[PDB]
Design a protein around this ligand. Structure first.
Ligand SMILES: CNC(=O)c1ccc(N2C=C[C@H](NS(=O)(=O)/C=C/c3ccc(Cl)s3)C2=O)c(F)c1
Ligand SMILES: [Ca+2]
Ligand SMILES: [Mg+2]
Lengths: 234, 52
């Protein structure tokens, strides 16, 4: 996360981190339930073996809420390809259930029509992660969050050098120095409504981080609600 | 602005328009209150709530 603020105690409880064999994060995730994590399909190419960590806000101290979980089943969208980054979504079923507590809770899955009419028409959404603090910097040792404005779809398509499919949406700023970045991909984009936070996107891709005339591109979760529901039953 | 487009039809969460009237519903883990509008968590650590 470039810019933004630190997630304070209990503010980002649905954050998950995909950690490699060396216990270092390489991608985010969103907690959906005691058994399921939502992430990006493209993250499943960034490490041979990985686990999921929840309840962590500082990677350099033991806060007492941290829990590591092994993955039992990886469910990648069968229409995803690295060539287009379309259908960039996967669900992970954990071997053991997440015990909810301070800093560990699921984000709500919304209904499609209501989310598109009411949540995606709000001014902003919230992205979070342990990713880079600058395009040319190190990963954050602190979980960060950032308010990102929803971006008009026409404006996004004109600013992009790649095809923005029906399965993608844009959020962020034209020139303001705030954006998601390297290591945040697969993480949560949530939208607040009456003090309840609903999953609205997955950090997917960007042409750099926080560049002028460029925005963050997120997987449009609302297009995949039936798919997520199916994946979480098997 | 009418029904659901009018302040979310007074619903806490999901709003639907059936037969010219508002119908509210809630995310899994919540139950719709007796008023047919508010959403009540069924247990601890309900989805979408910051933890206290
Ligand atoms: C359809 N477009 C693509 O196929 C595409 C385009 C650019 C990238 N790409 C190039 C550099 C970026 N790497 S990053 O780790 O810095 C991603 C950063 C993000 C910033 C805001 C986000 Cl939302 S994700 C990248 O993703 C990509 F992965 C796919
Ligand atoms: Ca820690
Ligand atoms: Mg920009």
């Amino acid at each position: 996360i470039v810019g933004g603020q630190e997630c304070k105690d209990g503010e980002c409880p649905w954050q998950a981190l995909l950690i490699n064999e060396e216990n270092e994060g390489f991608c985010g995730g969103t907690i959906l339930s005691e058994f399921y994590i939502l992430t990006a399909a493209h993250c499943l190419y960034q490490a041979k073996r990985f686990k999921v960590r929840v309840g962590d806000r500082n990677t350099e101290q033991e806060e007492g809420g941290e829990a590591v979980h092994e993955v039992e089943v990886v469910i990648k969208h069968n229409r995803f390809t690295k060539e287009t980054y379309d259908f960039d979504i996967a669900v992970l079923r954990l071997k053991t259930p997440i015990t909810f507590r301070m800093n560990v809770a699921p984000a709500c899955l919304p209904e499609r029509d209501w989310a598109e009419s009411t949540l995606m028409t709000q001014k902003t959404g919230i992205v979070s992660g342990f990713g880079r603090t600058h395009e040319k910097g190190r990963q954050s040792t602190r979980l960060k969050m950032l308010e990102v404005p929803y971006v008009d779809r026409n404006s996004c398509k004109l600013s992009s050098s790649f095809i923005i499919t029906q399965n993608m949406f844009c959020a962020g700023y034209d020139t303001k120095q705030e954006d998601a970045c390297q290591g945040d991909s697969g993480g949560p984009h949530v939208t607040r409504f009456k003090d309840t936070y609903f999953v609205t996107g997955i950090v997917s891709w960007g042409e750099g981080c926080a560049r002028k005339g460029k925005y963050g591109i997120y997987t449009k979760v609302t297009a995949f609600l039936k798919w997520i529901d199916r994946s979480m039953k098997t | 602005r009418k029904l659901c487009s009018l302040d979310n039809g007074d619903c806490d969460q999901f709003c639907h328009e059936e037969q010219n009237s508002v119908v509210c519903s809630c995310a899994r883990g919540y139950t719709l209150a007796d008023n047919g509008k508010a959403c009540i968590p069924t247990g601890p650590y309900p989805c979408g709530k910051q933890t206290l």
